[PDB]
Design a protein around this ligand. Structure first.
Ligand SMILES: CCCCCCCCCCCCCCCCCCCCCC(=O)O
Length: 133
């Protein structure tokens, strides 16, 4: 179900990430560094457990989760959120909840590229990831 998402992915296009970060209250200096960063995302599974790593020159994160089971997460911008990841229409949908707020991180495969759509408030960001061999 999730297997075409697995592997190492490199950022190759970003649209509106500053809008998304600003909506979350990320400070200007952080947004500035993050606008030039090209993370690597690694998605691996071991049975029912997925591990999603995001690596860059500015910040690393790692989460492990079971699809459909809530987990605690501390985001790159230090929000303490309640998270759940599920497959929905073949997309990997990550919902974060905190302080009555929500944001979604939706990953889809289109022509072998990984498209990540980030929504918070009215801000919508689209990031495109290609495969690393
Ligand atoms: C994911 C952190 C990776 C480190 C890269 C250097 C900074 C860019 C990521 C964000 C760190 C700055 C704070 C804002 C983070 C917002 C929420 C997560 C968005 C992930 C976008 C994506 O996975 O492409």
């Amino acid at each position: 179900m999730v297997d075409a998402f697995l592997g190492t992915w490199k950022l190759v296009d970003s649209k509106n990430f500053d809008d998304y970060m600003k909506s979350l209250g990320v400070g200007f200096a952080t947004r500035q560094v993050a606008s030039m960063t090209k993370p690597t995302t690694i998605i691996e599974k071991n049975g029912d457990i997925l591990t999603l790593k995001t690596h860059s020159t500015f910040k690393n994160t790692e989460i492990s989760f079971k699809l459909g089971v809530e987990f605690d997460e501390t985001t790159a911008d230090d929000r303490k959120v309640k998270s759940i990841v599920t497959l929905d229409g073949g997309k990997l949908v990550h919902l974060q909840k905190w302080d009555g707020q929500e944001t979604t991180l939706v990953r889809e495969l289109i022509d072998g590229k990984l498209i990540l759509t980030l929504t918070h408030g009215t801000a919508v960001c689209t990031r495109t990831y290609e495969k690393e061999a």
